[PDB]
Amino acid sequence: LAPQDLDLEILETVMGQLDAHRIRENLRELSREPHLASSPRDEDLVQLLLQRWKDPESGLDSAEASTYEVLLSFPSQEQPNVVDIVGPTGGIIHSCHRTEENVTGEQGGPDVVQPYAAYAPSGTPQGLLVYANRGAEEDFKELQTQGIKLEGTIALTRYGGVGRGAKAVNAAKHGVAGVLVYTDPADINDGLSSPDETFPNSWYLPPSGVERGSYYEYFGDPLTPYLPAVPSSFRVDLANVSGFPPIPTQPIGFQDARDLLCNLNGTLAPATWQGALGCHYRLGPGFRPDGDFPADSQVNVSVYNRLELRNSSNVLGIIRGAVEPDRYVLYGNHRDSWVHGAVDPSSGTAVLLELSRVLGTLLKKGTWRPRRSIVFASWGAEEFGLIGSTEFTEEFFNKLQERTVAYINVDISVFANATLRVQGTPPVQSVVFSATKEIRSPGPGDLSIYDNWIRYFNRSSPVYGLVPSLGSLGAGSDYAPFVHFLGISSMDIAYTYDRSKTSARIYPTYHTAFDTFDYVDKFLDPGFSSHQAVARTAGSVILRLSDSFFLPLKVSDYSETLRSFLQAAQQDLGALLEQHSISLGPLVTAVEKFEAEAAALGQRISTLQKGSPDPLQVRMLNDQLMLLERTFLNPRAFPEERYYSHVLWAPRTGSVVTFPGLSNACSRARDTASGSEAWAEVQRQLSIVVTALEGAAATLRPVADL
Amino acid sequence: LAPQDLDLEILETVMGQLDAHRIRENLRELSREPHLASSPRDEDLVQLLLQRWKDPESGLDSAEASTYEVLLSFPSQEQPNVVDIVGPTGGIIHSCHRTEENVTGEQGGPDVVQPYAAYAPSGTPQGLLVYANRGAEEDFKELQTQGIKLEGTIALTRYGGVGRGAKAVNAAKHGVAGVLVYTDPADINDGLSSPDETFPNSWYLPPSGVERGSYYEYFGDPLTPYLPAVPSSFRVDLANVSGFPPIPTQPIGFQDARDLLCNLNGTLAPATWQGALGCHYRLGPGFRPDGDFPADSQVNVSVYNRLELRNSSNVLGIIRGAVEPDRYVLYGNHRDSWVHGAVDPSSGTAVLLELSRVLGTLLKKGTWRPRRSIVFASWGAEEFGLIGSTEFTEEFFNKLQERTVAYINVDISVFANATLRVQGTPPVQSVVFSATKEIRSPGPGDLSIYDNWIRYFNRSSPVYGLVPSLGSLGAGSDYAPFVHFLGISSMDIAYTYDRSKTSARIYPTYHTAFDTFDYVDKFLDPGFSSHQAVARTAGSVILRLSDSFFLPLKVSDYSETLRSFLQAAQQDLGALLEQHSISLGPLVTAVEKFEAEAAALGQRISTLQKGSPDPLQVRMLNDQLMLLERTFLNPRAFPEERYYSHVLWAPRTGSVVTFPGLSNACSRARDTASGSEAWAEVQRQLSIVVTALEGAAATLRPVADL
């Protein structure tokens, strides 16, 4: 007769049933063949999910596929992309490698998509080579400042620093004709480059491995901004599409990068532009007369990529809530990969299958039904730009915004096995702290997941003292439309490596044809105990959100973030702002009001917990908690971005670490004259934050107070 | 122990306590002096509301004023606006009257703001006069087509047809230098114009009466689009403000218009341009040689209006809900007038005071506390453009959007005493039908309010047969930001006149210095029984919404509207659309899905009503009903409009009576080539509607169905 609440016996049963061996075998099946979005293998995996989730003994209440027709991009099987060194008459002097070398048994066959830059256009530019570091605006500016002619050149860049497509966008502003991208061994392999030093001998990236990836500027289907890609939909004209790289762009292996960069002529690049290819790096243009190639040689980049409409499916599954079925706890993972995608995303999908098996099995026994609905999602086409998740948020925008408690994402479950790492908005911190305190870490000692985690990623809180840190959410996976466009509190959970033992930017075989089952089984997670730890963490978070009578969301945890952003503004912008007749006084007041009201709400919750409150009273409080995140949305704040409406977490390019709209506006206004449009936009961005925080505070106050 | 529900004994108590004499006395005090927004008398009325709502025996739980600093517009007391007829050197031949004649003892004091066009700029244009009918684009085009030189002219127009500011906008596209506006006796007085025929002898407009009003293009404070006009917040630069009339504009009495128009030279105006000033109307330019003025004479319009920032307050009051205090039934009325405002808005405020007295008194007795919160609002600065209500919606956007059941507006309670009229969105129809069936009409017979209403305004429903018709909501009062911007189901209730007995565009003394207590007391509602009838209707609607366990909102009533819009599109646009490869097929499907889902939801509610459902089950259903209106919002549908996001009720300028974005896009695209940007925008607007309806249907489905 007491209202349904978190049942710790159910929780422990679930934690104890998550089976590392089942996860391993899931991963073996998921990663056995390449599974690019919209491929026949992608469709086999859609059917696998459906079959698992419709099973009468271990399935969910229901499961269904939904399909969108979306604009993807592929290279040509008939005319491969090629990078050649050519002479004055067009004779080929040297050809780069076309695809990964069959080093581990799974590469080099027609199943493997050639490396390419998805959404980069076809073309056949040819010109003198330059080296442009990470291809940031400041990198091309450095070349220009040095008197290097950029018009008509081919620019070689390394992954990292700025997004994939941005390298081509920034190049093209200087009239660069084509772009090459490689991963520098300094950036991913702790400076190692040899066959014996790299996979299959270690987790490191082999010399022929090539990061594939989306080079589109935005996320979501390119043709249908703010509308779902259902067959009938308005589509932007292929000519009116914004966000494609403007020039042909092609990624290459670091062995091919070595041949190019280590032969360049000219000035030594800055120390910060150096790497581990094996030589000092020079800037170009062109090759050095004492090197491997004639100094009149050019680089020809021939690209044959096509844009192609394709069907991509999501698979949704649901366990209906027993008491509040119109509240959703959403747990999602993308399904599609660049090649075999054993790590990305199949390590997550293997966990998705195992968690959903345990809960479905428990559901089918009659042992349990959660208080709120649990919705499981297998997203399609994430590698092309979060397409499947984005289209879902556009199609079910209102139903999701009114009803979703939180979105839990597991993309890669395991980057390595040293430590948990979690990214998320502050309302979700408390529940993942709670969950990880009560699960044992698979690593040495006898620590909980939480006590191991804090040894790797921590911060000092004025409230709690030293605690594990939560990373902020950008657009690195399918949480992006949930947090930035729908304003749903979100979390992303993984296990990862120790940054004191490696500086790798990501696990080294990311997005290559060396991301295979053996890579995980031998190196990342032998025994699969880290996959199991992530499954347990995600399962415990999910059940705490789906079953607890009072929702375990602490909106008061946002106060530290707001205060931190306010302090950075006061310290680094306050004087500049004052010079322009712009006061931070209303912002101070709004942060103080949020702090006061979120604290008072937490005290009213604590007070009510001491008795036996009515279900409706708790539902009213749970609505204030879960809908708080929505108050930071303003769809007019960032008109030059797409989907970003959350005024706390939109991309920040300004140097001050404060509210991103304010930081970016001050950066743009800084050298403009008083009374400029750019200064007026600083005031607009500041008033957008103040209004958002005042409105957030107003939702946390007692609901019938004026 | 049963959940709180509508208590008919409380309802009848309340109906029986609403006192016509108290309403009359309220109105006497409210309209005793002019009460322009931000005037000292406006502030006295703020303090009156506060005192009434804080009374410990007859007040509410709490009441508070909130103030915004907003840009208003006023004429100059030191240099009145003047319209003169002048000779070739500037000598004044004739002067028009400056303000209403002191015909009833309340006009002509310095308390009475001079007639003027609020937000029209200062200037002193002078030119030949033309007559341009209602000042529509087509009216100016007619003049141009006839070879009339419009550059540098003064254009005389009559109120009606297009909005006030639009007359000036349309004039200025043709280089007109200044605009005069009058109300034609044919349009408001059934053709009568003499002193003995008009107030104080009848309800008709005297020859010196002048309609004041906002000539701003949008609503909300002009300086703070999409942000609340609070202290130290962003204001656009006076130079970059959109929406002001581009040229000086001045309204005049019809006696002055007679002197002007009846002396024009030239071609006889079209039949539909004629009127009752007492002559055949000609077009100009200039005056006829055989008339009162030399034919070389010009009209000089000198306007000295200023823009001025002013404080304007809202007063909010609340009765906290006993069970669901986080659900709001909002009842509002504006407080500010142009002059005495006895009809507009004080007849509404008199009702607001009496209804709030009755409920507050019942509350204080301990007799009753509503299930949901009732919020009462006295809006400031509505006459300048719904400013007080709009700023409140901006300030409390999220709290209002998540929690408001409906907004009930009473602006003018009584235009006259013949019949109820109600405007609102379909989900509110069923509750006003229920209320009005159980209250007696004050008129002849022994009819209910409902059975009297259907004799005047009716329509044939395929569901219900003949029923009273509900008008649609545009931007005629403070419901505008609730419905168009927040997406809250809204209603406006008034009593009005019999259109078979008069063709008056509105009650004739609207916005003049003849809108006085005696006008109401002697002509519109002697005995105040129609005011009482509106108070009962609003009170009954309010209690049904605030107290009922199941909310009396029938979202299935939307289906008739959707189907009617679809049919208009199929009949009048289908062929044109097909000729441009645009299919209505997805629209038909989306309408069908809404119809199906809304009907099935109604059946599930009916089923649940037969038992003793759990409060949480009913809260879930009530959320689906009240939040359905929100699903029609799309803040990207109408980028050229301000605040209009609701894709059903945005302004329609296209001739086809269908979804307004679609109607408007097809009307713009019709005279463009295949494959034009205008045709692409037709498809965008169509897909916006399809997506909205599919999303609406999705929220009405069983909440855990995939």
Ligand SMILES: *[C@@H]1O[C@H](CO)[C@@H](O[C@@H]2O[C@H](CO)[C@@H](O[C@@H]3O[C@H](CO)[C@@H](O)[C@H](O)[C@@H]3O)[C@H](O)[C@H]2NC(C)=O)[C@H](O)[C@H]1NC(C)=O
């Ligand atoms: C609804 O409103 C109408 C219009 O005001 C009311 O009818 C009017 O009632 C007044 C009395 O309040 C009548 O005034 C009388 O007029 C005669 C002239 O015929 C005059 O000799 C008397 O000194 C007196 O002032 C007025 O004639 C009458 N108008 C009409 C058209 O009937 C009506 O009573 C209102 N309904 C209710 C329920 O109050």
Ligand SMILES: *[C@@H]1O[C@H](CO)[C@@H](O[C@@H]2O[C@H](CO)[C@@H](O)[C@H](O)[C@H]2NC(C)=O)[C@H](O)[C@H]1NC(C)=O
């Ligand atoms: C907080 O996190 C840091 C890592 O960011 C931990 O610092 C590491 O400490 C261990 C042992 O002292 C060394 O392996 C690393 O070299 C340290 N790294 C750095 C950057 O200092 C720190 O121990 C954590 N704090 C706690 C209390 O666990």
Ligand SMILES: *[C@@H]1O[C@H](CO)[C@@H](O[C@@H]2O[C@H](CO)[C@@H](O)[C@H](O)[C@H]2NC(C)=O)[C@H](O)[C@H]1NC(C)=O
């Ligand atoms: C965490 O991963 C590391 C790296 O794979 C594991 O350590 C390796 O274990 C294999 C056997 O599976 C040995 O062949 C390697 O020599 C080990 N490398 C190092 C650096 O120790 C470690 O066992 C994993 N932890 C768990 C709990 O499985």
Ligand SMILES: *[C@@H]1O[C@H](CO)[C@@H](O[C@@H]2O[C@H](CO)[C@@H](O)[C@H](O)[C@H]2NC(C)=O)[C@H](O)[C@H]1NC(C)=O
């Ligand atoms: C319309 O009438 C006004 C009012 O008489 C004229 O405005 C005056 O212009 C004179 C120039 O002779 C100035 O010296 C005055 O100070 C103005 N007076 C006021 C009271 O504003 C105006 O010039 C006329 N318009 C035109 C186009 O002739």
Ligand SMILES: *[C@@H]1O[C@H](CO)[C@@H](O[C@@H]2O[C@H](CO)[C@@H](O)[C@H](O)[C@H]2NC(C)=O)[C@H](O)[C@H]1NC(C)=O
């Ligand atoms: C429906 O409303 C119309 C008014 O719009 C009513 O028609 C009026 O009826 C009476 C007498 O038949 C006359 O005073 C008016 O001249 C009529 N107007 C028109 C346009 O016909 C009609 O009676 C209403 N229907 C019902 C059943 O009450």
Ligand SMILES: *[C@@H]1O[C@H](CO)[C@@H](O)[C@H](O)[C@H]1NC(C)=O
């Ligand atoms: C790659 O290596 C495996 C294992 O040695 C071999 O069987 C396979 O055929 C090779 N693939 C190609 C495309 O040559």
Ligand SMILES: *[C@@H]1O[C@H](CO)[C@@H](O)[C@H](O)[C@H]1NC(C)=O
């Ligand atoms: C680059 O090589 C391609 C492939 O042979 C050739 O078609 C193209 O013309 C070359 N580009 C230039 C600029 O010569």
Ligand SMILES: *[C@@H]1O[C@H](CO)[C@@H](O)[C@H](O)[C@H]1NC(C)=O
């Ligand atoms: C090659 O590099 C050197 C700088 O070391 C410079 O003097 C020379 O001119 C360069 N050659 C060309 C063609 O730029």
Ligand SMILES: *[C@@H]1O[C@H](CO)[C@@H](O)[C@H](O)[C@H]1NC(C)=O
């Ligand atoms: C997507 O699937 C539909 C339905 O099967 C098919 O008719 C359509 O052509 C497909 N689109 C593509 C791009 O394959």
Ligand SMILES: *[C@@H]1O[C@H](CO)[C@@H](O)[C@H](O)[C@H]1NC(C)=O
């Ligand atoms: C208007 O008329 C009344 C009533 O006769 C009179 O008392 C008042 O003074 C007049 N007002 C003005 C401004 O002349």
Ligand SMILES: *[C@@H]1O[C@H](CO)[C@@H](O)[C@H](O)[C@H]1NC(C)=O
């Ligand atoms: C006045 O009107 C008549 C048309 O009746 C026209 O013949 C005459 O030219 C007009 N005078 C002027 C100055 O336009």
Ligand SMILES: *[C@@H]1O[C@H](CO)[C@@H](O)[C@H](O)[C@H]1NC(C)=O
């Ligand atoms: C509005 O009121 C505030 C507070 O009293 C005052 O300081 C401000 O000047 C006022 N604004 C105007 C235009 O009167």
Ligand SMILES: [Ca+2]
């Ligand atoms: Ca889309």
Ligand SMILES: [Ca+2]
């Ligand atoms: Ca505003």
Ligand SMILES: [Zn+2]
């Ligand atoms: Zn991934």
Ligand SMILES: [Zn+2]
């Ligand atoms: Zn990936």
